[PDB]
Design a protein around this ligand. Structure first.
Ligand SMILES: Cc1cc2nc3c(=O)[nH]c(=O)nc-3n(C[C@H](O)[C@H](O)[C@H](O)COP(=O)(O)O)c2cc1C
Ligand SMILES: [Cl-]
Ligand SMILES: [Cl-]
Length: 317
């Protein structure tokens, strides 16, 4: 079968969402973009209390948190503009992740994401250094260029570095979500290359249900599909049997958020992204007023679950 991939998403792509996407059928889960300049300052810490592997910064902040459940399916995405810094980050996390990715599509310090697309010499140096320096499969996620000839020249050069696969968001650096995705440009890339092409940019316009994923993969002639917004809205998008009610989904998300001591502002943010219109509901208002993880659980009838879980984690700490 073809792969269902959770696209890298800043704030959204923390451990609870990654595990929840795996539960609903995602084959591969990408973590949020993490900046090389922050990751190079981190220490690998085994967390016995949570059964996690943490990457802790000198200010005691956990930058990246992973667990054995996602070890063979998690792809680490880094933000970098430097080959040596990229390799130093790859060497830090390689034993705990299944793959290493470089962000080359972010329009949002500079020199990273979409800014890299105008510097193919730097892309070449970063990717070749990573491929030779890690035993893990190396990938990159890109945006398309103003010209198809220039887009094709770039992907051919990227392929020559020895990367495992390329994720193509069929939008130009300047194009916003309202602009349609270019299926034909992903198809032109998929036809041209020998390596797997991961199609991306189909949420809402093409992907609203599970069956839409294979339709998008067929439209772009891609090896697999990477989903961002549709999974952010409802992680049960990956489930073959159909969408689960958001009530059900939010329950499972909060349980993981508590079990893996997720920061309450991050739990709140991800729930707000799922709710959207449902934020105006009494529950959405209680979520908005919530100032702790306990208060989030209270808004969702998980106060007892919170108490039992945190007391069991306080005992082993
Ligand atoms: C909340 C959010 C955060 C994003 N953060 C990242 C990121 O960390 N890395 C990345 O390469 N793309 C990032 N993206 C872009 C998505 O990965 C994706 O390319 C884009 O949303 C198009 O796919 P979609 O139509 O399935 O949403 C972000 C998108 C969203 C919605
Ligand atoms: Cl992007
Ligand atoms: Cl409290």
């Amino acid at each position: 079968h073809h792969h269902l991939i959770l696209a890298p998403m800043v704030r959204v792509g923390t451990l609870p969402m990654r595990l929840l996407a795996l539960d609903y059928g995602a084959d591969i889960v990408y973590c949020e973009e993490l900046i090389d300049l922050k990751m190079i300052q981190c220490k690998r810490v085994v967390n016995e209390v949570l059964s996690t592997v943490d990457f802790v910064a000198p200010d005691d902040r956990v930058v990246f948190r992973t667990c054995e459940r996602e070890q063979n399916r998690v792809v680490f995405q880094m933000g970098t503009s430097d080959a040596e810094r990229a390799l130093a980050v790859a060497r830090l996390v390689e034993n705990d992740v299944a793959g290493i990715d470089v962000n080359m599509g972010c329009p949002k310090k500079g020199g990273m994401g979409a800014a890299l697309l105008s510097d193919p010499d730097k892309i070449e140096k970063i990717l070749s250094t990573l491929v030779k320096g890690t035993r893990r499969p190396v990938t990159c996620k890109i945006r398309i260029l103003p010209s198809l000839e220039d887009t094709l020249s770039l992907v051919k050069r990227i392929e020559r570095t020895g990367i495992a696969a390329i994720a193509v968001h069929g939008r130009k650096r300047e194009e916003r979500p309202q602009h349609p995705v270019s299926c034909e440009v992903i198809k032109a890339i998929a036809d041209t290359l020998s390596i797997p092409v991961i199609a991306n940019g189909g949420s809402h316009d093409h992907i609203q249900q599970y069956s839409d994923i294979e339709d998008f993969r067929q439209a772009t002639a891609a090896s697999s599909v990477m989903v961002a917004r549709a999974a952010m809205w409802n992680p049960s998008i990956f489930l073959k049997e159909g969408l689960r009610p958001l009530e059900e989904v939010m329950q499972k998300y909060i349980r993981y958020a508590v079990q893996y001591d997720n920061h309450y502002t991050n739990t709140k943010y991800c729930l707000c992204q799922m709710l959207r219109e449902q934020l105006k509901s009494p529950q959405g208002r209680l979520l908005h007023a919530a100032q702790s993880s306990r208060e989030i659980c209270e808004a969702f009838g998980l106060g007892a679950f919170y108490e039992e879980t945190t007391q069991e984690l306080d005992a082993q700490q």
